[PDB]
Amino acid sequence: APSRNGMILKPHFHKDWQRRVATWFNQPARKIRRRKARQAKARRIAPRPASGPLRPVVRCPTVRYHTKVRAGRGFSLEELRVAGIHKKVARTIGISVDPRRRNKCTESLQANVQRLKEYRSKLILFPRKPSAPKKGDSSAEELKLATQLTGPVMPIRNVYKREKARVITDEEKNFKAFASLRMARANARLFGIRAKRAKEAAEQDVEKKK
Amino acid sequence: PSRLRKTRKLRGHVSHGHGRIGKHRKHPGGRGNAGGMHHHRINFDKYHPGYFGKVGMRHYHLKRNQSFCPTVNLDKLWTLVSEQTRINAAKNKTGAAPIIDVVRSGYYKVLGKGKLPKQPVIVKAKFFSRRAEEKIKGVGGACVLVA
RNA sequence: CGCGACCUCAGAUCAGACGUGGCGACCCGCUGAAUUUAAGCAUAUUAGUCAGCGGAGGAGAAGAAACUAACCAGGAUUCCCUCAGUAACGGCGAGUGAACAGGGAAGAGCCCAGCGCCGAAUCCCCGCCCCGCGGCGGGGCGCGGGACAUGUGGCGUACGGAAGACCCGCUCCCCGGCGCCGCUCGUGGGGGGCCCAAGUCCUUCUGAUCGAGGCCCAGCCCGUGGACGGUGUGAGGCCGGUAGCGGCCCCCGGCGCGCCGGGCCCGGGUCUUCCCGGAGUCGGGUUGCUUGGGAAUGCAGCCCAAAGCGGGUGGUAAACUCCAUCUAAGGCUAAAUACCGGCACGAGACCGAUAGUCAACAAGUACCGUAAGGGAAAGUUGAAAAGAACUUUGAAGAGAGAGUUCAAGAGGGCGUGAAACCGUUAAGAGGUAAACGGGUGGGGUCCGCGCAGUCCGCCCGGAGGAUUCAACCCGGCGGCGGGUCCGGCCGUGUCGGCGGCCCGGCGGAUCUUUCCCGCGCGGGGGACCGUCCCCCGACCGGCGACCGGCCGCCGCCGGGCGCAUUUCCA
RNA sequence: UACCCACCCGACCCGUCUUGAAACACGGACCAAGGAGUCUAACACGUGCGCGAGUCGGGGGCUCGCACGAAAGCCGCCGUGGCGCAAUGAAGGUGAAGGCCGGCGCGCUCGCCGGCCGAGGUGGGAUCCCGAGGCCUCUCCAGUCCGCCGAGGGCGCACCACCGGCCCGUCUCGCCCGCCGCGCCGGGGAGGUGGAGCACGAGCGCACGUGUUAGGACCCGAAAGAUGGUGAACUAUGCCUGGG
RNA sequence: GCGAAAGACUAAUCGAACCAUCUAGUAGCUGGUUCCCUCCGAAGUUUCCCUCAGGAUAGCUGGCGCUCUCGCACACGCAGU
RNA sequence: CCCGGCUCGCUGGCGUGAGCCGGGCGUGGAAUGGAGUGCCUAGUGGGCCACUUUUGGUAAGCAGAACUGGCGCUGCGGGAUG
RNA sequence: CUGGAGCGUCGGGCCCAUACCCGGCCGUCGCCGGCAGUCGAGAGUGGACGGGAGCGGCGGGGGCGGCGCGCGCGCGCGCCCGCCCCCGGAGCCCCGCGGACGCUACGCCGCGACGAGUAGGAGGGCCGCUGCGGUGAGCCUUGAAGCCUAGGGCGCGGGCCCGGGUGGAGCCGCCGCAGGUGCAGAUCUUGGUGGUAGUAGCAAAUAUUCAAACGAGAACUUUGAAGGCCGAAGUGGAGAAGGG
RNA sequence: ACAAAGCAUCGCGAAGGCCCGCGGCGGGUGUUGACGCGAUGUGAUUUCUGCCCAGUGCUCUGAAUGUCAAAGUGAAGAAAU
RNA sequence: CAUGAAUGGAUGAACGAGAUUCCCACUGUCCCUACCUACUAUCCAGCGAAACCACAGCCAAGGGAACGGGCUUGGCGGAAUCAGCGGGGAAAGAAGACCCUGUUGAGCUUGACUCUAGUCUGGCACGGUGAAGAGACAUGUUUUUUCACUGACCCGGUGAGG
RNA sequence: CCUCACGAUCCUUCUGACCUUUUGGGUUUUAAGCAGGAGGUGUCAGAAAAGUUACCACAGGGAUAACUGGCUUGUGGCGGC
RNA sequence: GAUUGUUCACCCACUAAUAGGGAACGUGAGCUGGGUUUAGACCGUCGUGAGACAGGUUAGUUUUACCCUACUGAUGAUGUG
Ligand SMILES: [Mg+2]
Ligand SMILES: [Mg+2]
Ligand SMILES: [Mg+2]
Ligand SMILES: [Mg+2]
Ligand SMILES: [Mg+2]
Ligand SMILES: [Mg+2]
Ligand SMILES: [Mg+2]
Ligand SMILES: [Mg+2]
Ligand SMILES: [Mg+2]
Ligand SMILES: [Mg+2]
Ligand SMILES: [Mg+2]
Ligand SMILES: [Mg+2]
Ligand SMILES: [Mg+2]
Ligand SMILES: [Mg+2]
Ligand SMILES: [Mg+2]
Ligand SMILES: [Mg+2]
Ligand SMILES: [Mg+2]
Ligand SMILES: [Mg+2]
Ligand SMILES: [Mg+2]
Ligand SMILES: [Mg+2]
Ligand SMILES: [Mg+2]
Ligand SMILES: [Mg+2]
Ligand SMILES: [Mg+2]
Ligand SMILES: [Mg+2]
Ligand SMILES: [Mg+2]
Ligand SMILES: [Mg+2]
Ligand SMILES: [Mg+2]
Ligand SMILES: [Mg+2]
Ligand SMILES: [Mg+2]
Ligand SMILES: [Mg+2]
Ligand SMILES: [Mg+2]
Ligand SMILES: [Mg+2]
Ligand SMILES: [Mg+2]
Ligand SMILES: [Mg+2]
Ligand SMILES: [Mg+2]
Ligand SMILES: [Mg+2]
Ligand SMILES: [Mg+2]
Ligand SMILES: [Mg+2]
Ligand SMILES: [Mg+2]
Ligand SMILES: [Mg+2]
Ligand SMILES: [Mg+2]
Ligand SMILES: [Mg+2]
Ligand SMILES: [Mg+2]
Ligand SMILES: [Mg+2]
Ligand SMILES: [Mg+2]
Ligand SMILES: [Mg+2]
Ligand SMILES: [Mg+2]
Ligand SMILES: [Mg+2]
Ligand SMILES: [Mg+2]
Ligand SMILES: [Mg+2]
Ligand SMILES: [Mg+2]
Ligand SMILES: [Mg+2]
Ligand SMILES: [Mg+2]
Ligand SMILES: [Mg+2]
Ligand SMILES: [Mg+2]
Ligand SMILES: [Mg+2]
Ligand SMILES: [Mg+2]
Ligand SMILES: [Mg+2]
Ligand SMILES: [Mg+2]
Ligand SMILES: [Mg+2]
Ligand SMILES: [Mg+2]
Ligand SMILES: [Mg+2]
Ligand SMILES: [Mg+2]
Ligand SMILES: [Mg+2]
Ligand SMILES: [Mg+2]
């Protein structure tokens, strides 16, 4: 029975909620179950990035998240035979491998290849055995570190470049940006019909000749 | 708390604030918003005008990210930038007109509300208003489009 | 009319295995209501919920795109925040009601069939020996079987692969044992066993204290221990315990070196030659349930029933048309995730015996019902039974004495022992049922008194008696306030130092890549501004923020003052 | 004052529904203990507090075996995100500024170029500011200090009333357009009208109250409906086998 | 189900058994609804409703305020006149 | 109220009219009293009686209106009782 | 009740409500109320300071008067000249130099007005119940909770404090927080107990009596004797099912 | 009241009549066959059983030019149609 | 009003714990009551309940919710009880079974609304082989009508025996 | 001539704009919008709806009958001028 | 007294007369149960039907006093040494 200017209030309690209510008194104890695992895993793989393998630089899909950059699922295959890392080997040197990424641009390719060239350089490969062969970094840069990287390895920071002040020319001061936008929004609108008149006006030149 | 509740002060009061003529029976009106057409019409029609009935056009599977477009007014443009880049202007004697990337501060559109300081600018955005064009132009400055 | 292969198919108490049932909180298939809501009701809603049924596990299911998207694009699944009570559904009403992106927890990927290549390169069970045997295996040897050509094993599976040619670079892991070395985070992994500080010190209560004062610093001692429980009250010290990278003894777990037995000739990049995908499925028609999915989301039954630059998807049917994006019809998979059952624990602003579970007890018991099922009531003597010997009356139950007890005015359903109600004793009343409100009076039980209650407290005057001072100075101590802001310390506003500025930093889409380091970007320096710190000088708020001197006053102590003073008493 | 008794006056038994209850209306022998407006979510307004065009809070994370801890603290997480900072249209979409002055297009209530001011005006407006004149002061006059009263005059918050103005939708009517294209292209004007709009802001979070709902929902109360089950030991028949 | 038929009988139950659950089913309808003091104080009327034992909206009520006025020798405003 | 002056795309032989700006002037019948305005909001939505007016009815402690007043919501003195 | 205690028309006098008047107390509302250290009762200014001077003054309305006059200006003393001085003291009815006992500043105080109430709202509750964070150098075996009291009192009241008694182990005051928080009632639930009442009742099938025994105790057991009934379609002698 | 003997209609030759069942190529009648089974009505005997096929039923080798769907076929379209 | 033919009409011996009427016989049914018996009740020893109960219990009249026990005014009132008694407590027993309301139900009905099992009919599928022949359209297709067959399928029998 | 002669949501249809959407582009159909009319709710602020119960049930109602009692007294009876 | 469930009615007969009424339309824990007014049945009418009928007809449980009062009897009671 409504009274005098409320809202309409469709609240969803008609079904049966009392039975399937999930209370969260685990919440602070779950914070601790995870914390031990997070620690017990880091102590189990001692020299290794605690955060996990290295993930690639990647852009977010929809136009509202255009300009951000994420940590992706794994480095793509096309990326890898540029840096020269075999696809099955990278899975064993802390490089997430995603065999499912269609690369469409060279911009995001090189930007993402750089992290793999960068990874190599600051990577210390404990050799297979104590007395072991090539590509295992020397004992000098083996004693120097036992450091797990707390936090993500080389965190992807959304970073921008400053554009200094300009001298605006008398060409940028002539652009009617509100005008051309309406133009472009009209050309994408009517391009399809305008070509059907050209297809018809091209038939009238062949229909007039016959 | 239960301590400051009118249910305390209603002890020894027989009807308990609900009147002894018409008692507090369970559900006299209906249950929920029930009877908008019938017998509750005076409410729905005089307080919620336009509740009942269809209107407009269906657009099934709408997604907000398609049509995402925040807005700035020229009222607060020099707020997006650190105010010292404004003080390192109206000065400098060169027509510096620092660049304001409205995209970087999270706005895909610049609308023309409010006064604008007499100062040259370059405003990079996605979609402009017409009056926001004229306010920047007439102050001396450019409107630069970004994809 | 015989014998022999194979294909079908029987029988065995044949050799060896395995399945059923139980539990059921969480989980997975299916089945599936009606109360209810809509103020009626049939659609809807309740609700893919209850019940029914099947099946599991320590988690299950899901899972490596026939995906999302339209972007400069993302990349298995599951969970949390979010999207959002939104797009959509709906007698568009009641009501219902997702996803995508983004952030995060976690993060792991993989196999077949086919097409092919390889002398079936394979697997099973027997029989002898070698090791191993309380999760039955490895090693060898056998014309010992059998499966398999209607197809086992190695490479290989779409991310491409194989095969070749040549380009480059050089080769340890796996398993069965046999040992041995470091006991390996709650700060020695799991479990068990046994162990580790300090008062029963003085006095005093008391039935007994663990209480009250006291005891070389809140008393003595210990304190990495002061949680809790026990103990005849209220205890860190009496007892168990507690703390403690405390000790010791077994067992188990798990990881690390050696020996042995076996398995294994396993790479990486380039050019060419071929090689390819799962059918009664997809898809369409239709009917039924389902979603929110709409000219049909998902699922089905029936009918039709494919293709190979094909097929699906691209959220309004359709044609044409371009683009994008995956690869279905086969399979495996840890982690975050769930747990009102079970084992074992820990805790509480919870209940405290009509509460809290039905159940603090011989409780799912007594008891009811033919049965399905229903289902209670009921905790407390004392500290110790020290639970009443004995004498006596009585057939005996019960008494009277006695005794035990701190208490039997704690006596075996015994702490406390309320009210209703009843018994008797005392007092007062009593023909309009009682009871009641106002007003007094009479009587009582006590209570305050008085064996005058004359209540006190100043000041003063008088008469008695007694000790030392006040007043005054002098010595010392300690304050107060005051100003000269006097001398110094302190901070507010301002100015100067551009002095901290690099011996002050932090912040900033300020500026320079003249720089430096690392790979146009990142990091670091250098320039800039805003802000915060040092030197000194000046003005001013001179501020409870002080210190030293000077002063004025007060007070206390100690001296001096002996009595027309100054106090005490009556 | 409370125990008993006495008297004079008053005086019908409470709860309840009810126009009306002492009622020949119903519940009530008596006494103990139990016993009824709760929690959650969602709004709304009021109020308190923090911060303020921002402000969080969750989930995560970083810090413990918790004793007190399943606390407290901290995190470009602090903004991914919500709410707010902007509306309006069914939608494609657009989107909050005007004034003034000078100059130039014929000032044409039209179009363009340089400068100034910037949220318009009217009426009330708490109200601050300025204040003529007074009012004394022991003398006549002189005169600076201090206030009281203060006619009259000014700025004028908040708010209210009104007139203007701008944004969007729609209409009407009419003009000039710009030209990366060609105008079944886009762009401007004047007048009216629809809007939950702007017209130098007020929100966010956290508490508490009141109210309304959805919840079993202040407590107790149906006749029913549904799903699974257990009964022919009574009785209703049929059958089988015995007895009278 | 069974009925030589009465809606009879089906374990003291029959115009439709008993048991447990869905279930605290729904109720515009009865019944109850627990301490004091202080201040304010109603309605039974309006329109609409498958409305007539109920609601919705009007009123009437309270609470919270705010905007001012000036008994501070120096008041406009309102009114069951 | 009374003057002065501006504005108009309406109205018209001119003027109307309205709108603005600028000045010039105070207690306009009696009696009473501080007024204005915004938020939330409970209960109620069976009513009954009397003077007067009045509709059905023969009449009613009947049915139904008006106007005010009560009773409900409220005791006290009076009407013996109510 | 009858030249009235009757009916008309009239006198005086008297009687009484919670109404009205005066007074007392309690609360509520109002006072732009007073009081955080100050003069001042139709208040109708106060103070520098200079020049000049003095019995001058401000020679204005039967107004009856308000704004100006007769407790002083200047004055006594120091001696025409000086002063006209300081509260660490004027001695105080105004004291502006320092402020109550009073001043828990949500405290205290002075004026007025007013106080019916269901349904309902609001406020205040040193009203009460249980529990937590604080705090009370709280209380307690020299006696806590509870219970009982013709014991002394406080509050308008919710309730509270004391006195005694029994009881045998714990408990409350204040500042905050939290509730399953207050009972007369629901044919309320559970338990207990009355009045009814020593009442209804112990009446279906004809029947008992004497003596003895045993025994504390005999109408009721046992034995003997007598009278009787069931009367073999049994109250007799054996079985089924059921009971155990 | 029911039952009842009796009288009477009615369906049915077994891939049948009536009937059960959730389902089977399942069951009852049926260890049956029209003197049988199933479905009704009246109610011994005696004496009778009259008119009405318009209505509603039931039924009929009955015309189905009335209508009438799924598929099916036909046509237009580019295809849903 | 409003009988009547198997919704059976008319009759009718025997029969009936079936419904009426009359007569004979009989009688305490009655005029009109009386006495007798047994068991009670009654009193006693023993043993001992329950329904019910606001408070309770003498009347007239008045008013009043329009029939009081209580209230107003009168009348009056004397402890504690026993056997009876049925005037009163609108006595107890049962939230009236009648009636009306409810947007509460059930049982049954049908020409209510909406559906359903079942059954009738068509289509499609399993569904084949061979034979003739015909129409319609077209200048092969379709519709197919009819008669055969036996391998699916179906029923029948037996100890699957010619 | 004035005071009555009429109808929401949803749905359907018709009409209007070289309208908008038809969703990865483009062209056509088709569908969805926008703005006006119509198809109708007579219970007319707008449910899609027949009975019976003497076998009955529940919640209630003296708000609503069938007794008594009151008020009234037409009618009935009795009596006057 | 005859008839009638009857109140009411009508007659026979007697008489002095066969007046009229109230007391919850006196009087069911006083009776009876004939009539109404459950469930069984039967007809007529009505209804397609379940069923309806102030239209008839037959069969159909009539509880409790011991309480207070009243009343009837029965003991007593304070007073009168
Ligand atoms: Mg991570
Ligand atoms: Mg009240
Ligand atoms: Mg009530
Ligand atoms: Mg199993
Ligand atoms: Mg409903
Ligand atoms: Mg309802
Ligand atoms: Mg219903
Ligand atoms: Mg439904
Ligand atoms: Mg569902
Ligand atoms: Mg289930
Ligand atoms: Mg799995
Ligand atoms: Mg799987
Ligand atoms: Mg995903
Ligand atoms: Mg939101
Ligand atoms: Mg749903
Ligand atoms: Mg192979
Ligand atoms: Mg020890
Ligand atoms: Mg201890
Ligand atoms: Mg202890
Ligand atoms: Mg499929
Ligand atoms: Mg559905
Ligand atoms: Mg489409
Ligand atoms: Mg797969
Ligand atoms: Mg107990
Ligand atoms: Mg207890
Ligand atoms: Mg219990
Ligand atoms: Mg006990
Ligand atoms: Mg006890
Ligand atoms: Mg004792
Ligand atoms: Mg004791
Ligand atoms: Mg005891
Ligand atoms: Mg006595
Ligand atoms: Mg009434
Ligand atoms: Mg009465
Ligand atoms: Mg009642
Ligand atoms: Mg139903
Ligand atoms: Mg009522
Ligand atoms: Mg009402
Ligand atoms: Mg009052
Ligand atoms: Mg206690
Ligand atoms: Mg004890
Ligand atoms: Mg509690
Ligand atoms: Mg209680
Ligand atoms: Mg005999
Ligand atoms: Mg025997
Ligand atoms: Mg017949
Ligand atoms: Mg005939
Ligand atoms: Mg016919
Ligand atoms: Mg007797
Ligand atoms: Mg009676
Ligand atoms: Mg109704
Ligand atoms: Mg029904
Ligand atoms: Mg029909
Ligand atoms: Mg397409
Ligand atoms: Mg009947
Ligand atoms: Mg019947
Ligand atoms: Mg009535
Ligand atoms: Mg009557
Ligand atoms: Mg009678
Ligand atoms: Mg009687
Ligand atoms: Mg009777
Ligand atoms: Mg009878
Ligand atoms: Mg009958
Ligand atoms: Mg007949
Ligand atoms: Mg008929």
Coordinates of all heavy atoms in Angstrom, one line a residue, chain D residues 17 25-26, chain E residues 30-31, chain I residues 95, chain J residues 60-62, ligand 35:
Chain D
rC17 P -10.9 -2.3 21.4 OP1 -9.7 -2.4 20.5 OP2 -11.0 -1.2 22.4 O5' -12.2 -2.3 20.5 C5' -12.3 -3.1 19.3 C4' -13.7 -3.6 19.0 O4' -14.3 -4.2 20.1 C3' -14.7 -2.5 18.6 O3' -14.5 -2.0 17.3 C2' -16.0 -3.3 18.8 O2' -16.2 -4.2 17.6 C1' -15.7 -4.2 20.0 N1 -16.3 -3.6 21.2 C2 -17.3 -4.4 21.7 O2 -17.6 -5.4 21.2 N3 -18.0 -3.9 22.8 C4 -17.6 -2.8 23.4 N4 -18.3 -2.4 24.5 C5 -16.5 -2.0 22.9 C6 -15.9 -2.4 21.8
rA25 P -27.5 -8.4 27.1 OP1 -26.5 -7.5 27.7 OP2 -28.2 -7.9 25.8 O5' -26.8 -9.8 26.8 C5' -25.4 -10.0 27.1 C4' -24.6 -10.0 25.9 O4' -24.4 -8.6 25.5 C3' -23.2 -10.6 26.0 O3' -23.2 -12.0 25.6 C2' -22.4 -9.8 24.9 O2' -22.6 -10.3 23.6 C1' -23.1 -8.4 25.0 N9 -22.4 -7.5 25.9 C8 -23.0 -6.8 26.9 N7 -22.2 -6.0 27.6 C5 -21.0 -6.2 27.0 C6 -19.7 -5.6 27.2 N6 -19.5 -4.7 28.2 N1 -18.7 -5.9 26.4 C2 -19.0 -6.8 25.4 N3 -20.1 -7.4 25.1 C4 -21.1 -7.0 25.9
rC26 P -22.9 -13.1 26.7 OP1 -23.7 -14.4 26.4 OP2 -23.0 -12.5 28.1 O5' -21.4 -13.5 26.5 C5' -20.9 -14.0 25.2 C4' -19.6 -13.5 24.8 O4' -19.5 -12.1 24.7 C3' -18.4 -13.9 25.7 O3' -17.9 -15.2 25.5 C2' -17.3 -12.8 25.3 O2' -16.7 -13.2 24.1 C1' -18.2 -11.6 25.1 N1 -18.4 -10.7 26.2 C2 -17.4 -9.7 26.4 O2 -16.5 -9.6 25.6 N3 -17.6 -8.9 27.5 C4 -18.6 -9.0 28.3 N4 -18.7 -8.1 29.3 C5 -19.6 -10.0 28.1 C6 -19.5 -10.8 27.1
Chain E
rU30 P -13.7 -7.6 12.7 OP1 -14.6 -6.5 12.7 OP2 -12.2 -7.4 12.7 O5' -14.1 -8.5 13.9 C5' -13.1 -9.0 14.7 C4' -13.4 -10.2 15.5 O4' -13.1 -11.4 14.8 C3' -12.7 -10.3 16.8 O3' -13.3 -9.6 17.9 C2' -12.6 -11.8 17.1 O2' -13.8 -12.3 17.5 C1' -12.4 -12.3 15.6 N1 -11.0 -12.3 15.2 C2 -10.1 -13.3 15.7 O2 -10.5 -14.1 16.6 N3 -8.8 -13.2 15.3 C4 -8.3 -12.3 14.4 O4 -7.1 -12.4 14.1 C5 -9.3 -11.4 13.8 C6 -10.5 -11.4 14.3
rG31 P -12.5 -8.5 18.7 OP1 -13.5 -7.9 19.7 OP2 -11.8 -7.7 17.8 O5' -11.5 -9.4 19.6 C5' -12.0 -10.5 20.4 C4' -10.9 -11.3 21.0 O4' -10.3 -12.1 20.0 C3' -9.7 -10.5 21.5 O3' -10.0 -10.0 22.8 C2' -8.6 -11.5 21.5 O2' -8.7 -12.4 22.5 C1' -8.9 -12.2 20.2 N9 -8.3 -11.6 19.0 C8 -8.9 -11.0 18.0 N7 -8.1 -10.5 17.1 C5 -6.9 -10.9 17.5 C6 -5.6 -10.8 17.0 O6 -5.3 -10.2 15.9 N1 -4.6 -11.3 17.8 C2 -4.8 -11.9 19.0 N2 -3.7 -12.4 19.6 N3 -6.0 -12.1 19.5 C4 -7.0 -11.6 18.7
Chain I
rA95 P -16.5 -23.8 22.1 OP1 -15.1 -24.2 21.6 OP2 -16.8 -23.5 23.5 O5' -16.8 -22.5 21.3 C5' -16.8 -22.5 19.8 C4' -17.2 -21.1 19.4 O4' -16.2 -20.2 19.8 C3' -17.3 -20.8 17.9 O3' -18.7 -21.0 17.5 C2' -16.8 -19.4 17.6 O2' -17.9 -18.5 17.3 C1' -16.2 -19.0 19.0 N9 -14.9 -18.5 19.0 C8 -13.8 -19.0 19.6 N7 -12.7 -18.3 19.6 C5 -13.2 -17.1 19.0 C6 -12.6 -15.9 18.6 N6 -11.3 -15.7 18.9 N1 -13.3 -15.0 18.0 C2 -14.6 -15.3 17.8 N3 -15.3 -16.3 18.0 C4 -14.5 -17.2 18.6
Chain J
rG60 P -13.0 -16.1 13.8 OP1 -11.8 -16.0 14.7 OP2 -13.8 -17.3 13.9 O5' -13.8 -14.8 14.0 C5' -15.2 -14.7 13.8 C4' -15.6 -13.6 12.8 O4' -16.0 -14.2 11.5 C3' -16.8 -12.8 13.2 O3' -16.6 -11.8 14.2 C2' -17.4 -12.3 11.9 O2' -16.6 -11.2 11.5 C1' -17.1 -13.5 11.0 N9 -18.2 -14.4 10.9 C8 -18.3 -15.6 11.5 N7 -19.5 -16.2 11.4 C5 -20.2 -15.2 10.6 C6 -21.6 -15.3 10.1 O6 -22.4 -16.2 10.2 N1 -21.9 -14.1 9.4 C2 -21.0 -13.1 9.2 N2 -21.5 -12.1 8.5 N3 -19.8 -13.0 9.7 C4 -19.4 -14.1 10.3
rG61 P -17.7 -11.4 15.2 OP1 -17.2 -10.3 16.1 OP2 -18.3 -12.6 15.9 O5' -18.9 -10.8 14.3 C5' -18.8 -9.6 13.6 C4' -20.0 -9.3 12.8 O4' -20.2 -10.4 11.9 C3' -21.3 -9.1 13.5 O3' -21.4 -7.7 14.0 C2' -22.3 -9.4 12.5 O2' -22.5 -8.3 11.6 C1' -21.6 -10.5 11.7 N9 -22.0 -11.9 12.3 C8 -21.3 -12.6 13.2 N7 -21.9 -13.7 13.4 C5 -23.1 -13.7 12.6 C6 -24.1 -14.7 12.5 O6 -24.3 -15.8 13.0 N1 -25.1 -14.2 11.6 C2 -25.0 -13.1 10.9 N2 -26.1 -12.9 10.1 N3 -24.1 -12.2 11.0 C4 -23.2 -12.6 11.9
rG62 P -20.9 -7.4 15.5 OP1 -20.2 -6.1 15.5 OP2 -20.4 -8.6 16.2 O5' -22.3 -7.1 16.3 C5' -23.2 -8.1 16.6 C4' -24.6 -7.7 16.0 O4' -25.5 -8.9 15.9 C3' -25.4 -6.7 16.8 O3' -26.1 -5.8 16.0 C2' -26.4 -7.6 17.6 O2' -27.5 -6.9 18.0 C1' -26.7 -8.6 16.5 N9 -27.2 -9.8 17.0 C8 -26.8 -10.5 18.1 N7 -27.5 -11.6 18.3 C5 -28.5 -11.6 17.3 C6 -29.5 -12.5 17.0 O6 -29.8 -13.6 17.6 N1 -30.3 -12.1 15.9 C2 -30.0 -10.9 15.2 N2 -30.8 -10.6 14.2 N3 -29.1 -10.1 15.4 C4 -28.3 -10.5 16.5
Ligands
MG35 MG -17.4 -11.8 19.6

